[PDB]
Design a protein around this ligand. Structure first.
Ligand SMILES: OC[C@H]1O[C@H](O[C@H]2[C@H](O)[C@@H](O)[C@H](O)O[C@@H]2CO)[C@H](O)[C@@H](O)[C@@H]1O
Length: 368
């Protein structure tokens, strides 16, 4: 009691938060502890399931419906005046069973970050990446594209591009049995990713870390990452641009828009202290700008603050791609989807399964 323990993934600005935390204490004389586990997404459900853990917790809203259905998260109640400070859509994202289960922090979406000093003009097509059709670049391709291949969230826009989909959205409801993970669209997208690899263009063991170091050092021209990545690049002295993602089979790459939400542990007896921290401190200009400077938020859910930095060009592009992708469901079976697809991508890329056997397997694990 009298001490907030907040969790926030490692790629987010945990140091920005902690600082805001100090601002709390310098006023309320309360200790806020910004920890940031590894796999906090999966630990949380397990630690709070036993009345233990973090007071407050951060994660892209797709994981909240689950926490909710199990009841590890307190129903939040800000007044309608506060609610209006935030764009409507973001509140919709933290809505489960007609009950707000989190505070919206910011909207994020992947983009194509390219090295302006190697590629003054980044491709407009995935199909150009392996075969560029321009002798000016051939002498350049260094690796052309490197991004994390371990998390399915990175491969999704490609798979989605020509028609893949998680759970079918039927105006207000998602038919949780109409899974579009194994179908031409998904097959076509994954097959391409496999060629990129089997055609020496990409390496199956690329994870966030490798791709980041690589693009940052300058040993690859292009990468795909969220707003959080921009920070290290700025302190890597790399000349980069953030643009719309390449189109696959003519259609655009549809990212999966995620809303960084900060919930409250039901098992926590510090709820009135969370509300004030999140409401009067973080969810403000000065507060969000604090977290933000550590590592960029994307389009912050706070209106006033979203507009000021709305003029930032990468925020503009982050919104362009977000605009083409679909915002992700917060239903409980999302977690089943990610685990099922991660595995699917891995075996596909790794060579352990055919594109079809791999995808039909994931599908089935989801519909089972
Ligand atoms: O890849 C599946 C996971 O993707 C999303 O997670 C993203 C997360 O939203 C993003 O902000 C983060 O920074 O990268 C991860 C994946 O590396 C979903 O939020 C996760 O819960 C999924 O499991």
């Amino acid at each position: 009691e009298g001490k907030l323990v907040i969790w926030i993934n490692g790629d987010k600005g945990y140091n920005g938060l902690a600082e805001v935390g100090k601002k709390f204490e310098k006023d309320t004389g309360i200790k806020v502890t910004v920890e940031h586990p590894d796999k906090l997404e999966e630990k949380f459900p397990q630690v709070a399931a036993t009345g233990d853990g973090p007071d407050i917790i951060f994660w892209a809203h797709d994981r909240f419906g689950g926490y909710a259905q199990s009841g590890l998260l307190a129903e939040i109640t800000p007044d309608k005046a506060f609610q209006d400070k935030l764009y409507p859509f973001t509140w919709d994202a933290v809505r489960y069973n007609g009950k707000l289960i989190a505070y919206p922090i910011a909207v994020e979406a992947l983009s194509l970050i390219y090295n302006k000093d190697l590629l003054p003009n980044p491709p407009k097509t995935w199909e150009e990446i392996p075969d560029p059709q321009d002798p000016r670049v051939r002498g350049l391709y260094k690796s052309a594209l490197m991004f994390n291949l371990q998390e399915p969230y990175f491969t999704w826009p490609l798979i989605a591009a020509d028609g893949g989909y998680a759970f079918k959205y039927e105006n207000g409801k998602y038919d949780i049995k109409d899974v579009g993970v194994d179908n031409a669209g998904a097959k076509a997208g994954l097959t391409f990713l496999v060629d990129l690899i089997k055609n020496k263009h990409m390496n199956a063991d690329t994870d966030y870390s490798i791709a980041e170091a690589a693009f940052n050092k300058g040993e690859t021209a292009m990468t795909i990452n969220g707003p959080w990545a921009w920070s290290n690049i700025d302190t890597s002295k790399v000349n980069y641009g953030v643009t719309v993602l390449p189109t696959f089979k003519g259609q655009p790459s549809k990212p999966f828009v995620g809303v960084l939400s900060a919930g409250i542990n039901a098992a926590s007896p510090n709820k009135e202290l969370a509300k004030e921290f999140l409401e009067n401190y973080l969810l403000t200009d000065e507060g969000l700008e604090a977290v933000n400077k550590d590592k960029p938020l994307g389009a912050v859910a706070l209106k006033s603050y979203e507009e000021e930095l709305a003029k930032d060009p990468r925020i503009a592009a982050t919104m362009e791609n977000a605009q083409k992708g679909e915002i992700m469901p917060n239903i409980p079976q999302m977690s089943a989807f990610w685990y099922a697809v991660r595995t699917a991508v891995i075996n596909a890329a790794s060579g352990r399964q055919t594109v079809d056997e791999a995808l039909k397997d994931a599908q089935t694990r989801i519909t089972k």
